[PDB]
Every structure is written in C-alpha cells, then in structure tokens.
Design a protein around this ligand. Structure first.
Ligand SMILES: *C/C=C(C)/C=C/C=C(C)/C=C/C1=C(C)CCCC1(C)C
Length: 227
C-alpha cells in the first residue's frame, strides 16, 4: 500500500518499542514494591502503543468512513490504544498523590467516556453529528483535566516536595499534551479534513510518544516513585 503516513507509523513503533524495553529493563532491576508498581504501569503504556502502531503500520486499525461526500480514512486502532493507555497514565498520577479510590474510579470512568464518544464520533456518518460526539468527548477530557489541576495538585501538597514537584511536571506535560488531541482531531481527518493524514499522523506520534515515553522517563527517573 505504501500510504504517505507510514513513515510516522514506523517512527512511532520504533520509539514506543525502545521506550518499552528500557523501562522494562530498568523496572525488573528495582526491588522497591512501590517503584515496581509505577514501573509496571509505565512500561505497559508504551507497550500497548507499540503494538497498535505496529498493527497500523502493517495495515490494520484503518477503516473508510463515509461523510462530507468522501470515503474518509479513519485509524480506529488509536482508540484501542488510548482506551487502555490513557487511564493507565491517569493511574500513575493518582498513585503519586495518593488519590482516593472514588477519584480514580471517576477519572477512569470519565476517560472511558472520552475515548468511547471519541471513537463513535470518528465513525459517525452524518458530518455534523461527528462534532456532537467530539464535543462530548472533549467535555469529558476537560473534566479529567479540571480534576488533575484542581484536585490532585491539592492532595500532592500532603506529599513531600520531591513528590509534589514531580507531579507538577507530569501534570503540566499531561495538560499541555492532552489539550492538543481534540484540536488535531477537529482540523484533521476525523473532522474538518484541513490537515492531511500524513501530517496528522506526525502530530499524533509526537503527542503519543511525548505523553508516554516522555512522561515515563520523567516519572521513572524520579525518587518520588519509592515507597
Ligand atoms: C498516550 C495517549 C494519550 C496521552 C492520549 C490522549 C488522548 C486524548 C486526550 C484524546 C482526546 C480526544 C478528545 C478530547 C475528543 C475527540 C477524540 C479524542 C479521543 C482524540
């Protein structure tokens, strides 16, 4: 097939894979119980992404959805990835500030809605309705970000400055990166079709790699992960 976006898929695969192995190697050497928890979560995240990037590279996870008078190329494999990677990243942040079970449940639940409505919107055949689902998915994300900024930051103040300062950074990287996804979706292939798929794939790989390997490197190299 040789689609224009494959090089970004191959690059995403490579980066996720290398990041996975390095976290795996680093994680199985640590003896601390808590640090092991964070490592297992942070390694599984890029591991899931690698497999999905690989699948997409190999021609799977792609479907032609009709709308706007066109047969639009929608990579649904992305939601299969994010369905499990986004709540795992949220869990990493939750364990860090000692969030409550109710908070985590609600964050994972909101996250499920965000990805669920996101995919339904990416598969919707009525053009304008695609944005109705997109709208709801974004509202869900704004709820998650509100909680991360107003809730978690507050409970991280009961933590040690080293831990509070690590969370601040991860929280900041997450707010900035996650905020970008709904915009790429809106102006890209799933939405307005302004930005081409090849470029759109490039944008997604930069955000995904940054949000998983970038995030993991920052979190796993800190001493805040220790019990
Ligand atoms: C490793 C992957 C990460 C950190 C993915 C984050 C993805 C989002 C914050 C996605 C958000 C979306 C919306 C707000 C609405 C439209 C559809 C989505 C799923 C692209």
């Amino acid at each position: 097939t040789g689609r224009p976006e494959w090089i970004w898929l191959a690059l995403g695969t490579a980066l996720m894979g290398l990041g996975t192995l390095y976290f795996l190697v680093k994680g199985m050497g640590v003896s601390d119980p808590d640090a092991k928890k964070f490592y297992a979560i942070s390694t599984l995240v890029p591991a899931i992404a690698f497999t999905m990037y690989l699948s997409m590279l190999l021609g799977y996870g792609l479907t032609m959805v009709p709308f706007g008078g066109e047969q639009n190329p929608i990579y649904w494999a992305r939601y299969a990835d994010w369905l499990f990677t986004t709540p795992l990243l949220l869990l990493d942040l939750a364990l860090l500030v000692d969030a409550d079970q109710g908070t985590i449940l609600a964050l994972v639940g909101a996250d499920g809605i965000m990805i669920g409505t996101g995919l339904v919107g990416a598969l919707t055949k009525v053009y304008s309705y695609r944005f109705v689902w997109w709208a709801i998915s974004t509202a869900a994300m704004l709820y998650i970000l509100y909680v991360l900024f107003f809730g978690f930051t507050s409970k991280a103040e009961s933590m040690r400055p080293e831990v509070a300062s690590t969370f601040k950074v991860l929280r900041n990287v997450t707010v900035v990166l996650w905020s970008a996804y709904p915009v790429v979706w809106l102006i890209g292939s799933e939405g307005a079709g302004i930005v081409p798929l090849n470029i759109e794939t490039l944008l997604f790989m930069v955000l995904d790699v940054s949000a998983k390997v970038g995030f993991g490197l920052i979190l796993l190299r800190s001493r805040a992960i220790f019990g």
